[PDB]
Amino acid sequence: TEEEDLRRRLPCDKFRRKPCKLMLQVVKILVVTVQLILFGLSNQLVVTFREENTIAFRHLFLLGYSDGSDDTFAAYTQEQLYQAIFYAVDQYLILPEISLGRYAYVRGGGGPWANGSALALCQRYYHRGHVDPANDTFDIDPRVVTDCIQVDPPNLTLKFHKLINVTIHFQLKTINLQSLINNEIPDCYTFSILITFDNKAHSGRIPIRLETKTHIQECKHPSFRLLFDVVVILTCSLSFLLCARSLLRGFLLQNEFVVFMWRRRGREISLWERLEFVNGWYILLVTSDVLTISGTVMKIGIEAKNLASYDVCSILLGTSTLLVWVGVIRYLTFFHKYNILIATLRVALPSVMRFCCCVAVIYLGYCFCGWIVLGPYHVKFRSLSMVSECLFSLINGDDMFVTFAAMQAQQGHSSLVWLFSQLYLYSFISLFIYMVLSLFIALITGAYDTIKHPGGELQAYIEQ
Amino acid sequence: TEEEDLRRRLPCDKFRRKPCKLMLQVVKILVVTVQLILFGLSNQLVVTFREENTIAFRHLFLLGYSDGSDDTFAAYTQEQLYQAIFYAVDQYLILPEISLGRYAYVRGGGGPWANGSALALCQRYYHRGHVDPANDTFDIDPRVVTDCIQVDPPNLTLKFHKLINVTIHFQLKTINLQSLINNEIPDCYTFSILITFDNKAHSGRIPIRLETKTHIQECKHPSFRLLFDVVVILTCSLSFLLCARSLLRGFLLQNEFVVFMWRRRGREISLWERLEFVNGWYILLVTSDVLTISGTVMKIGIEAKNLASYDVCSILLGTSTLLVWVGVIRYLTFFHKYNILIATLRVALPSVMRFCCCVAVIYLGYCFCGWIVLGPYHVKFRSLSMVSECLFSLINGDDMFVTFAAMQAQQGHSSLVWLFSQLYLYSFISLFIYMVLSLFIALITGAYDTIKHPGGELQAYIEQ
Amino acid sequence: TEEEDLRRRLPCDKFRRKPCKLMLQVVKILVVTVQLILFGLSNQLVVTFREENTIAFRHLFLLGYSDGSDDTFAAYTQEQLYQAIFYAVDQYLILPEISLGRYAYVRGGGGPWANGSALALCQRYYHRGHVDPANDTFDIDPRVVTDCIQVDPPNLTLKFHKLINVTIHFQLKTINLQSLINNEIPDCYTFSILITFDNKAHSGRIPIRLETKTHIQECKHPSFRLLFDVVVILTCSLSFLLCARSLLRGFLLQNEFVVFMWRRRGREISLWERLEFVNGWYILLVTSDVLTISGTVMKIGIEAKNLASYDVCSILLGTSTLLVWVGVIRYLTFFHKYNILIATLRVALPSVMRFCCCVAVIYLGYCFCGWIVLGPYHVKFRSLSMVSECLFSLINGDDMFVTFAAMQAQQGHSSLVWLFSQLYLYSFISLFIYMVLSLFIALITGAYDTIKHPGGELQAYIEQ
Amino acid sequence: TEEEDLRRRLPCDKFRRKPCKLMLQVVKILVVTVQLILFGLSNQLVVTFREENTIAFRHLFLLGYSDGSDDTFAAYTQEQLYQAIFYAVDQYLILPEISLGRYAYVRGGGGPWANGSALALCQRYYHRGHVDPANDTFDIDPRVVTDCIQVDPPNLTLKFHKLINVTIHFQLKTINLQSLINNEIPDCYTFSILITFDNKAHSGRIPIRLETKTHIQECKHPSFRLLFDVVVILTCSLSFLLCARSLLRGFLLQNEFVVFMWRRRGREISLWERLEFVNGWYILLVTSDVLTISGTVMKIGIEAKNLASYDVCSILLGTSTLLVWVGVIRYLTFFHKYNILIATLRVALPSVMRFCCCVAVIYLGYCFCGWIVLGPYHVKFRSLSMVSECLFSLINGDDMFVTFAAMQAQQGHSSLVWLFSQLYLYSFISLFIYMVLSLFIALITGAYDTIKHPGGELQAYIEQ
């Protein structure tokens, strides 16, 4: 078992590869990360391309549109409602003659089966909608009927009470020429454009929005980097295999330990080990495996069902790097000249975790105040929602000036509430602020307490 | 008395219901809270409905209105003054032909007795108002006269010196169809609209505003959730009763103690007990009772006089949850593995409270600086008012960049004041900031001091 | 001398008026403060009146004026320059027919001797200004000539190179009717209006501004509160006298002490006493005297030369209240149950003051970085100026997001500077932030150090 | 060697010039700094002149330009594209008749060789650009061709697919008259104006910008301050020489020490000395030398190749002052009554530096989260870029309200991401905030730890 203890001890190489593999993976893993950033950078530019395209589309297909008007862009009058739709209509008609871009649209029918449009002007309304507020009655069959008019590239009215929503659907193709700057072959994009005039609230206000989906592929006529990505993916598989192997060794050790604690004296009893870290030699590899598995997956099987899947997988990769980033420093610390910083973290959670819950508890009540208080005035608080948003306010500056004072002159109303709003909000800023440092501080003192001890398996060691 | 001591000790069940009741109430209480949130969520949507309606009304009845113009929307010329009024007038005339909503208005006369309008264009002016600034005199009978013109759904001038204010009052009814999305029967709303052109300042500037009151009821032709709310209300009564019972037990204990301290030796003397907490076993129940009493009340007797009363009662409920929230954790802590976090709070107040007053004292002077300084420049400081608002600035970021620098280039004026404004405001940021952490810190150290002891009835215990 | 020691000890009354006087003064002083706030509140409203008037005047006399355009309101073309001047001109002509206020203007000539205008359209230009950039020469006699055109209430061009500035001066009288709401007799205001088209920079940009001075007096035909103010002023004199008396007693004590330290043994040697506080028994009274002297002065002798003097004096009053506020708590503390909070402040300054200078020193270098760095990009840093403004940024949030990031995409220019701007600004945020808490903290620990001793004349005491 | 030890000890003068030199340099150095500020202030005004000129030029040559529109100023339609160019064109034609300034432009051809314009309307496009998105192909010869039209002071169309960019280049001369206010002779400026209509992204959006370069010289017909600057430069040389001398002495001491440690016993072994500071007696002088060398250089040899070089050199000067500022206080401290503040800094770095890396490590992972997360939503995060920008957010307020909440309602998209964005960003705010104070705190405690020891060569000293 002495060998096993030595293994647990693991510097060891110096006493003397496997580390290189582990070392390679961060570099291997680090490189894949590099590949992701490189993929990420390209995506961002192309992400950049998408952003540019979106701004343009909004400006191109939107009438009366203004920057920062997205929050409020809407129609308020039938005369108001019609003009944009006509305005939108105009763009489809006249695009080749006015746009600063070169777009081509053909076929591409949606979204119900068949046929061509390119874009279909659709109308959705209740199959039956007798609405008579004057006599406080209505009679409704809420089944939604969709009437769509087809427009082929080179004036329809729906009753306002009737409208549920109006959409305009069309597709435009364009070449991504910017690629030439990054020494790449221009891409072939197909933009699916959806303009929605939403009347689902039947509020007299109809917000209008334009959204786009982008399908990207190689042009009609045409590996290097792709091959490199494939090699990177293969390396990741090797790293995952190495992790599985290490995991197996750890499991054997556990069996020895499970056997060992029991085995020597028919020995009892099992120990949770509390934090028992350390922690990462095994936990980290699995996460890495998850990150590794994900990359292959994004590159592979559900990449044949693209968009959400690609993005989600990327999120997993991030955990590995910082974990990937994190592991290296700990490996990197090499005891970090005795690893003083590392020890500091562990003590706090035990006290902090208990501390966190009470704080959440103190917080939960604070959060509820928001639910009751909010409805009467302000938009910041209104749902769990903003109530989550406030939580930002107490910790940090940006909120405090704007609500606390903006609120006081107020929308107001209710003399008591104005009395009420100060009474509570004011209460709110203070309690956490004095406490929070202490929780960090008391822990921080505790860390100092961790430090005081700090400032200056066991049996096995003794035996050795 | 040993039994009494055991009762004080109260884990006890484990030594062994009542806890379940107490337990039920938080769940019962927690559920009512859930009901409130559910009520709160519905209200917010409906609160949402109200917000939408308000924005729409402003846009609908307002001419030249702009978003964020509420702060400044006003008339400056008689030509200016007339146009909106005409503009407002137009809306009443032409609403059925231009609005994206379906409104019906009938009868509903206000606000002096009689009759119909629907909306009355009223004029208020001084019975006698000879105003002659050219000769520095005036002769006034300030009794206000109200002339109202009635307009029945399908050009009047008042002297500018004369105007006190002009109002436009009218009611519109509409069905709340959005309810269908939340699977509810559409509601019947009556919006009371009041547009005010306020000349009370006789400043040459007439701010114009539009406000609405909403009366909500079931449509003309038509329990589940209501029944559930009733059941919840009944449960609350049971909880209140349980609290009264517990309170009675506590009182009996107090009599024993009042009797006991005196009784054994003709014993003296009474002890305040300082904080004596703990604290919540009795204090918490009463608050809960207040919250419980309030819910029934909002649901019940002064709910037959609706609006302010409903809102105020909700505020009371919040105290119970966080208190409701708070109690559970303490109950929940079950000593919290020795309840270390809980102890921490108590020591500080004793020192902190003393600390808070001095700070208020340091603060009171700081606040006064604001009253004298403010009038000359800036709008942020001007009344107790903003002076309260500044208090936000020192603690948190949002204020500091905007005033301190915006002020320095300044509206300015007075070479000394510009010298003056920096001299003091600059003084202001520093003193609290170094101190405040210490007050938390010194307390925090004190908490550490609380901690240092921390880091590691009496007679009765000894006897036991 | 024992009696003298007892006097130094001063609770004493309880051992047993003078305190009541001292007590009266804060109340007396507190009341005067109350009077000031009352004066301050009235002034603020009237301050409110002034603000309203200013906004109105700007809107009234300004063409193309927009809110928040004050920062940028200016003319850029001769066609541009003329229109406002004509526009301003129009207002004088047509005011009685378009304004929502009632203004009367007569006589009131300015600003050179004579005569009437009411407002004079003045032109200032260099007596001689041959300016020929094409041949890189000029010949100038910088003496300024002022040509003014007089306009009597019921098209002049100056060469652009020629212009130094153009002003429009006129006076308008109006009655302050709002006073009626606060149950006061309307006031008689005379507004002196000055519109300036400033070409002193000869930059091609001419900023245009409108400013007003307000002369306030009783109407032509017409004590209570004034009498009360007078009584308050008299009380203040009594308080000052009491302070002088106390000061004399302190001086006698000092003579005893000066005599006493020397006298007993031909005794040496004098002690500075370091902080020797305490501190306020004498320091506070003098400040109070300054505040007291100032109030009488504002009310009295240089109030016959009004405006700056009135405002400056008010500033002095503030010191007394907070000092007025401050003294009471210390008196109020009555040892504050042993006055623990009070002791805390003293230790820190001794270490903190030393700390403050080094910090200023660390800061001075930080500030210089601003002077060199700033000119190239951004407006925030540019002069001592903004450089003062930045100092706000490090401590508090509002600055950090806006410059640090806004700067990075940047106006930029200079590849190194973009490298440069991050390199230094980034350096800037960190150094103070870690340190500052420590300075408070290290002091705060020191306060704890103050606390550690804390947590738990001499000869005279011993003798006693 | 005793003398050498005494030298190391260096108060010494009091035991007793060289200090005066050192003293002179800060004053000498301080004065040069003063000169720089004076130079800096003049530059800023002139910097002010440049800013004014830029705003004016933008307004003057820009059509439809709006303040704060710089971020977005662009053309979207050929009809849109043409108008500004015509608009810009108009300004060159009509400037003498509309501008509020007096500009003269002659000769000054750019930027390819020859000849006159003054401004050349240039067009850059691909030598060959067959672009056919409809058939997903293109055929391109990316060599850029530049066609420029010359316009001599008293309608050309390029295919949109074709455009790479269009520029307008012209020069204007003007006299800087404002100088008269600062009692200086007006300067002769030549502004090189470049307007760019950038189509390099071929995105359908063409951003338009105007930039200026300023060449400044004395007018055609015409030392004091220049002589003074020269004297200052000479003084700096003397200071540098003094530093070299001191450095030589230090080197001799090092030889003695290098000889001494080895020499006495054939002695070993060399000590790094860790921080060994102190530190500045030698390090500071060299930096000063760099600052000193730079000033002469800016004034001298590469000043005959002006602009970037002048600015960069200034940056070096700043290090000396704060270093210049810093040294004096340490010299100034004169042990600072035992120099307690100075000691405090040293201990922390040893622990802090280790702490900083781990933090960077914790941070590096945090930063990566940004790269993956950002692309989907928001502009704040998008590149290393903003990811750097976020780092501002956690420490300070301005960021936290705006992203955290603005993000939550969101651009959004992806139900998981909305789940995702909160899950991580929320994670992000907390971890550093509790930790950071501790790192300062734990160090701060450590500083206290530094303090605890604090609160209360060797061999050579002993010998002495």
Ligand SMILES: *[C@@H]1O[C@H](CO)[C@@H](O)[C@H](O)[C@H]1NC(C)=O
């Ligand atoms: C075209 O649309 C009509 C419905 O309007 C549908 O019946 C028909 O099948 C469609 N044909 C094609 C080719 O899409």
Ligand SMILES: *[C@@H]1O[C@H](CO)[C@@H](O)[C@H](O)[C@H]1NC(C)=O
């Ligand atoms: C109406 O809009 C909603 C999104 O707000 C969408 O889910 C629904 O399918 C649309 N229905 C019609 C008929 O457009």
Ligand SMILES: *[C@@H]1O[C@H](CO)[C@@H](O)[C@H](O)[C@H]1NC(C)=O
């Ligand atoms: C109608 O208004 C007049 C006052 O203008 C009032 O005298 C009369 O009683 C009112 N009648 C009704 C039915 O409101």
Ligand SMILES: *[C@@H]1O[C@H](CO)[C@@H](O)[C@H](O)[C@H]1NC(C)=O
């Ligand atoms: C004038 O407006 C005020 C509110 O600012 C209101 O209280 C008062 O009743 C109104 N009077 C008239 C005649 O409108």
Ligand SMILES: *[C@@H]1O[C@H](CO)[C@@H](O)[C@H](O)[C@H]1NC(C)=O
């Ligand atoms: C009127 O102005 C002229 C200068 O234009 C001056 O000479 C004359 O004395 C003034 N008279 C009065 C009464 O102001």
Ligand SMILES: *[C@@H]1O[C@H](CO)[C@@H](O)[C@H](O)[C@H]1NC(C)=O
């Ligand atoms: C020009 O304006 C300045 C203030 O910027 C003022 O001091 C000066 O007296 C004015 N001179 C003339 C002739 O208007």
Ligand SMILES: *[C@@H]1O[C@H](CO)[C@@H](O)[C@H](O)[C@H]1NC(C)=O
């Ligand atoms: C003028 O420009 C033409 C090109 O358009 C060039 O060939 C010629 O040399 C130039 N001459 C001068 C004096 O710039």
Ligand SMILES: *[C@@H]1O[C@H](CO)[C@@H](O)[C@H](O)[C@H]1NC(C)=O
């Ligand atoms: C186009 O603009 C870029 C800067 O964005 C510049 O570097 C390049 O020289 C320009 N080329 C032409 C032909 O204008």
